[PDB]
């Protein structure tokens, strides 16, 4: 029962080369290089599903700090005052409100200040 | 330079020719082997 | 002496970016015969400025 590999091997290599579209040079053309490129891309994507959550919170916090300091308070005191006021709004929403509704964020700041007062 | 092959047809045929092969039991077995392999040219000869 | 890595398609074409040929910018036109010719060269028919300079 002699088994030839051509059909399965072509399909196995095509699957990798399709995943490598857009990559520079041999990384999009050459299986040996493309397989390594696609694996490392998956390793990075796994890693960056985690870093994406760190990076966005880093961005949300930076915008809250900017908006808060424009309303006379640092991020750290603002987060504390909101905890003392039992506000459970998270960083993704506070940062969206800081940009898109600057009057509502100012109201959140005077609530935070009131709780520290 | 003088290279190793210096052709002489007399010496070619006395060393490796048909009758030189047929002269000995072991040369006759050379021809047998080359017949068994199906050699077109059994010997050097001509 | 020799390369430690295969240069790419790209670096090859960058080196060949100065290999393009220059087309002859314009051809001159003889006053007498109308022939196009290389400037300061005679025509195929043997004319030059307006003179037939070659026997044939």
């Amino acid at each position: 029962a002699r088994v030839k590999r051509g059909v399965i091997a072509r399909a196995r290599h095509k699957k990798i080369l399709k995943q490598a579209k857009g990559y520079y040079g041999a990384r999009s053309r050459v299986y040996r290089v493309a397989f390594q490129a696609v694996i490392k891309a998956g390793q990075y994507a796994y890693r960056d599903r985690r870093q994406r959550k760190r990076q966005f919170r880093q961005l949300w916090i930076a915008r809250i700090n900017a908006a808060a300091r424009q309303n006379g308070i640092s991020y750290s005191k603002f987060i504390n005052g909101l905890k003392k006021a039992s506000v459970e709004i998270d960083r993704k929403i506070l940062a969206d409100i800081a940009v898109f509704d600057k009057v509502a964020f100012t109201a959140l700041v005077e609530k935070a200040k009131a709780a520290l007062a | 330079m003088k290279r190793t092959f210096q052709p002489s047809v007399l010496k070619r045929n006395r060393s490796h020719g048909f009758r030189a092969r047929m002269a000995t039991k072991n040369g006759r077995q050379v021809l047998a082997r080359r017949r068994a392999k199906g050699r077109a040219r059994l010997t050097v000869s001509k | 002496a020799v390369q430690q890595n295969k240069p790419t398609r790209s670096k090859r074409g960058m080196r060949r970016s100065h290999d393009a040929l220059t087309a002859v910018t314009s051809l001159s036109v003889d006053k007498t015969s109308g022939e196009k010719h290389l400037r300061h060269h005679i025509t195929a028919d043997g004319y030059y400025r307006g003179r037939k300079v070659i026997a044939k």
Binding site: - | - | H41, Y48, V53
Partner: protein, 120 residues
């Protein structure tokens, strides 16, 4: 460097250069128009025109100098009996170089070099 130096080497030794321009000068005088490479034609001016200059004064010494420079007495005769008189009033410029394109075998820039009054 080559500052202020004249003479094309033409990838030859001196002796080949002298021999060939002697042959080329004779061939130009004989036929009055020759096709050659452009740098060889430009150097032939510096060989043929002093000959025609010398041939304006017919004297046994001058025919012998020309023979020394040509080694062909058909050329001496034509120089001294035809070209000397024809160019007796011309103050130089006995030759004309006509650029004529490029040679098939080597793409050498080619030129015709004429005597200026061929009148075939």
């Amino acid at each position: 460097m080559r500052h202020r130096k004249s003479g094309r080497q033409l990838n030859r030794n001196s002796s080949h250069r002298q021999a060939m321009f002697r042959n080329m000068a004779g061939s130009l005088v004989r036929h009055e128009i020759i096709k050659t490479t452009l740098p060889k034609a430009k150097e032939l001016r510096r060989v043929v025109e002093p000959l025609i200059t010398l041939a304006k004064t017919d004297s046994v010494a001058n025919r012998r100098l020309a023979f020394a420079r040509t080694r062909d007495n058909e050329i001496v005769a034509k120089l001294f009996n035809e070209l000397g008189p024809r160019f007796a009033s011309r103050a130089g410029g006995y030759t004309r170089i006509l650029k004529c394109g490029f040679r098939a075998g080597d793409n050498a820039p080619m030129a015709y070099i004429e005597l200026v009054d061929r009148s075939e």
